[PDB]
Design a protein around this nucleic acid. Structure first.
Ligand SMILES: [K+]
Ligand SMILES: [K+]
Ligand SMILES: [K+]
Ligand SMILES: [K+]
Ligand SMILES: [K+]
Ligand SMILES: [K+]
Ligand SMILES: [K+]
Ligand SMILES: [K+]
Ligand SMILES: [K+]
Ligand SMILES: [K+]
Ligand SMILES: [Mg+2]
Ligand SMILES: [Mg+2]
Ligand SMILES: [Mg+2]
Ligand SMILES: [Mg+2]
Ligand SMILES: [Mg+2]
Ligand SMILES: [Mg+2]
Ligand SMILES: [Mg+2]
Ligand SMILES: [Mg+2]
Ligand SMILES: [Mg+2]
Ligand SMILES: [Mg+2]
Ligand SMILES: [Mg+2]
Ligand SMILES: [Mg+2]
Ligand SMILES: [Mg+2]
Ligand SMILES: [Mg+2]
Ligand SMILES: [Mg+2]
Ligand SMILES: [Mg+2]
Ligand SMILES: [Mg+2]
Ligand SMILES: [Mg+2]
Ligand SMILES: [Mg+2]
Ligand SMILES: [Mg+2]
Ligand SMILES: [Mg+2]
Ligand SMILES: [Mg+2]
Ligand SMILES: [Mg+2]
Ligand SMILES: [Mg+2]
Ligand SMILES: [Mg+2]
Ligand SMILES: [Mg+2]
Ligand SMILES: [Mg+2]
Ligand SMILES: [Mg+2]
Ligand SMILES: [Mg+2]
Ligand SMILES: [Mg+2]
Ligand SMILES: [Mg+2]
Ligand SMILES: [Mg+2]
Ligand SMILES: [Mg+2]
Ligand SMILES: [Mg+2]
Ligand SMILES: [Mg+2]
Lengths: 101, 97
RNA sequence: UGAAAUUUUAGUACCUGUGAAGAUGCAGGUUACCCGCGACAGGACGGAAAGACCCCAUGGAGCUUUACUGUAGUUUGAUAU
RNA sequence: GGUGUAGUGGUAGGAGAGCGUUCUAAGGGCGUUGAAGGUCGAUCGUGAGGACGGCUGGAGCGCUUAGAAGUGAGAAUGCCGGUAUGAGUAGCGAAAGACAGGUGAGAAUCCUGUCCACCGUAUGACUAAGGUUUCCUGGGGAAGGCUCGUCCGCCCAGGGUU
RNA sequence: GGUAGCGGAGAAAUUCCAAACGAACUUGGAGAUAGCUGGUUCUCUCCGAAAUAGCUUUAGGGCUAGCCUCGGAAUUGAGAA
RNA sequence: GGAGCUGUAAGUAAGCUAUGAUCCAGAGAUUUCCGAAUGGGGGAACCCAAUAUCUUUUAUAGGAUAUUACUUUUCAGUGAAUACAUAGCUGAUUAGAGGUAGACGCAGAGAACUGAAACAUCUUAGUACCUGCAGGAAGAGAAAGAAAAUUCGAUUCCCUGAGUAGCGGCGAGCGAAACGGGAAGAGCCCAAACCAACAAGCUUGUUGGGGUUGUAGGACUCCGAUAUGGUAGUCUGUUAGUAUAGUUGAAGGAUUUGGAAAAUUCCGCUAAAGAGGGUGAAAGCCCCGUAGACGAAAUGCUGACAACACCUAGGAGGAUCCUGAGUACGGCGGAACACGAGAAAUUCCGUCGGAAUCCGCGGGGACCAUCCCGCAAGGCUAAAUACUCCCUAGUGACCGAUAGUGAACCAGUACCGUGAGGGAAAGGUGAAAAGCACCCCGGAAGGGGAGUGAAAUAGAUCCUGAAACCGUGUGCCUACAACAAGUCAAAGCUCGUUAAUGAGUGAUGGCGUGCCUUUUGUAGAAUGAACCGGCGAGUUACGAUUGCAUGCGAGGUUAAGUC
């Protein structure tokens, strides 16, 4: 997948449009991704998860990975991805510039 | 079916037979041949190439109903006598294949 | 606590007559405040069941026989082994 | 297109004109500023039927021409599903229970106890088959139990056959 | 344990053979056949019958004619009163 | 291949992973027990053994592994009546079993309902069913032919011939073939005469050589080539491709609405890519992908190319020999041929009888003669043809949850039945569980607030949410009235529209016996319907005929098949 854990990322669609953030986890079998600060839903929680009030948590729901646009780590302008065989090894590469990742 | 009443086919008699050696000839009635240029040679090959006769069943027979107006070296399997008269009178020539 | 058969819709009287010939429903006349409860069972040609009596079908099935046509077996002969 | 004359009851049935549904091809256009469908309207057309609005709804659908059909339902003792009717009616499936206490949100119905009644060549004790977990313990009362139920051969978690 | 349907068993009744046995049940041929009953869905307009003859192992079925409808055609306009 | 992975299936735990995981593909290993089940048995998924080695135990008992079914083929050893021997027995070997694909095709056996308006011949139908053999296809197949042309040259299949010729209680119905056109194309072996070798007992069994045919052929007698082409073969190899994993694969950002933009507007970009799908709504430019370009270590498959292997000869004579025997044929009885004994050729089965062989034999629809064509009684043979349990890629003027498979959901399930067997129902929250923390009533369920959410009258009976049916309230009317329950007129009362000779209700009066079916005729005491909703009946293929329309016109038109 063109998205991978440890990647600063821009969002394309949603109420959290134009926000940035990194990848906390990725679900390829759903083609979804989780992003800190984005889609922070308010979950009425029970205390069976070591939360001795039950309470109301705020946690990041997944996001569909097609609503996402990666960032150049050297430009800030968000881009699309190509795959290139550099040094024999296959890596992601920016469009709009040849920067890796 | 007439409701059990004796049907029309059953109350009537069978008649005749079929001759397996029957010769059924393809007919050309002498008004066609005003087509072809005088003096030429008419044949089953010519008639087929023109499209007049498509089925040379047993052979071409020529018959005289219409008026002939040409000299023609016609040839076929059989001619009728009136056709012979008309052709030979116009000035043609009968042959037989 | 909780069914069923039945059920075209129904604010479902009586006499006489009419009428697919025996009417809760049509007519004419009469009687009858509205809604129920318990009982009965005259009617709704009540329900149940495409009448088992009858007739029809060029229907079916079983059965009988000196009906027809055949046949398994039984018997006689010829021939082969 | 108009004027006149004459006609326009209708079954079986024949003929001709259509409305509507689904889909397709093309054209064109309408939809989160809310499509279809649903529902109410006192609307238009000779009829089949067609619009426009109000509320619902939440994503696909109309209009023109032509075409292809699983093309139109009120009956088939029709099929499937739903809900009525009878009707809160019959029935609640042979027999004796009463009381005090207790448990409990709640008790004719469960538990403990005392009297009482029933069986007793059995309504008792073994046991083959068959059933195949219904046995025991601890909880439960959603459903089942022809009532109820704190209870059960029901449900749930564990165990049990040497 | 044995007898199985063109059959078995029958102290024999047409009796029993897994809750209807004059020939079980099931599957297939099979959407059997049905001159028989029931049903057959939107509209308008034009016209509009018959229930008769003859024949029929035919009589509540069918065929032809008769009666209806539609299209064409021609003919000294025959048709009706 | 390159980072999340431990299925459905949440959730908890424990853990794995660039030391390259999960995942994907090829090959190999393990593969319990039943089942052909096969050591013996048995009520399948259980039991009990024999022999050899090894193991446990002080030793038994116990345990593991291997082998042990029957039948066929060959070989060997023993060996009865019975002497020789054979049978039999034992041991080694060899190849069969059984189910699939509810489909296709050869053979055996073989119905009836039905139609003939009854019915027996006949038809349905050599169908269904059963059984056997199978193969990817099978079967048929290289003329004892088709014809009448002196001519075509192996089978099969499509068109056509043709619904013709014929068959037929001359009824109902049945129904060809050849010619012609095409698809595909291929022809080969053997016995026999004779020759060489072996053997017993000059013939006669085995091996090899030879030789396969009809303008007759071969053996045999003479003349030279040692050739020349082909192959319907081989895990002989190589080579190339292809199937089974895959990789890459261009182009957009902002305004309005809105919860969300893919919609709207703005200017752009791209296209060997505007196929399709998904993405918070309808996206050419977000994603998967598409066009296009690359790629296989390993196992298969296909086709070529070399090696091996197998076939492959020519000209005269016919002195003599051979050229498929209980065979062809005939009689009787039956079948199949379109052909129902009929004038009945042809083919086949049973039975009985019973030929010649090159001056020979069979056919040309009884049969004889002439002519022509062919040479049986021995075998094989690809291709075009039929079918799909299945695999891959897909397509639809096919279905869209009473439809489409019986089954979109753990369906051949639950359930019914002793059993064979029959046989259901049941889909949709939301973009995302964010699925209602917390509070109150209550035993709980279930409600009410709060809160998430765009929306909760989207909260598990979850999108929409009709009707029947059950209710609540409210405007008008109703307790001297009989009424297929409406219609027409109409007072009074109450509301105010798709604003137009308005809506609702309705005292009271006049007229008026439901709908369907079937009937001479039904309000019907003749039939059907409890009601609502869904489903549910003149269609298609091939032909014929009539009309309408078009094209062409005494010429109008192709079928099959190829691209
Ligand atoms: K009564
Ligand atoms: K009888
Ligand atoms: K309908
Ligand atoms: K009869
Ligand atoms: K073959
Ligand atoms: K798209
Ligand atoms: K014959
Ligand atoms: K009235
Ligand atoms: K026509
Ligand atoms: K024409
Ligand atoms: Mg008669
Ligand atoms: Mg009477
Ligand atoms: Mg009377
Ligand atoms: Mg009246
Ligand atoms: Mg009472
Ligand atoms: Mg009755
Ligand atoms: Mg009756
Ligand atoms: Mg009229
Ligand atoms: Mg009138
Ligand atoms: Mg639609
Ligand atoms: Mg229909
Ligand atoms: Mg109905
Ligand atoms: Mg009562
Ligand atoms: Mg009791
Ligand atoms: Mg006693
Ligand atoms: Mg107990
Ligand atoms: Mg109860
Ligand atoms: Mg208990
Ligand atoms: Mg008797
Ligand atoms: Mg049949
Ligand atoms: Mg065994
Ligand atoms: Mg019959
Ligand atoms: Mg044919
Ligand atoms: Mg791309
Ligand atoms: Mg969408
Ligand atoms: Mg755009
Ligand atoms: Mg012969
Ligand atoms: Mg014979
Ligand atoms: Mg279904
Ligand atoms: Mg639905
Ligand atoms: Mg009075
Ligand atoms: Mg009053
Ligand atoms: Mg009345
Ligand atoms: Mg009635
Ligand atoms: Mg009724």
């Amino acid at each position: 997948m063109f998205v991978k854990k440890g990647d600063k990322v821009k969002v394309i669609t949603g109420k959290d449009k134009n926000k940035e953030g990194v990848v906390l986890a990725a679900f390829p079998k759903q083609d979804k991704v989780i992003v800190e600060g984005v889609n922070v839903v308010k979950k009425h929680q029970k205390p069976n998860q070591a939360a001795p009030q039950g309470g109301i948590l705020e946690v990041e729901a997944p996001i569909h990975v097609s609503n996402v646009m990666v960032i150049d780590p050297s430009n800030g302008e968000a881009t699309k991805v190509a795959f290139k065989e550099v040094d024999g090894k296959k890596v992601r590469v920016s469009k709009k510039t040849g920067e890796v990742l | 079916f007439e409701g059990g009443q004796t049907p029309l086919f059953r109350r009537l008699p069978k008649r005749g037979f079929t001759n397996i050696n029957r010769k059924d000839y393809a007919v050309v009635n002498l008004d066609t041949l005003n087509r072809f240029e005088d003096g030429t040679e008419v044949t089953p090959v010519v008639l087929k190439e023109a499209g007049i006769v498509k089925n040379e069943k047993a052979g071409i027979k020529v018959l005289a109903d219409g008026e002939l107006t040409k000299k023609l070296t016609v040839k076929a399997a059989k001619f009728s006598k009136s056709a012979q008269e008309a052709i030979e009178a116009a000035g043609g020539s009968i042959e037989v294949i």
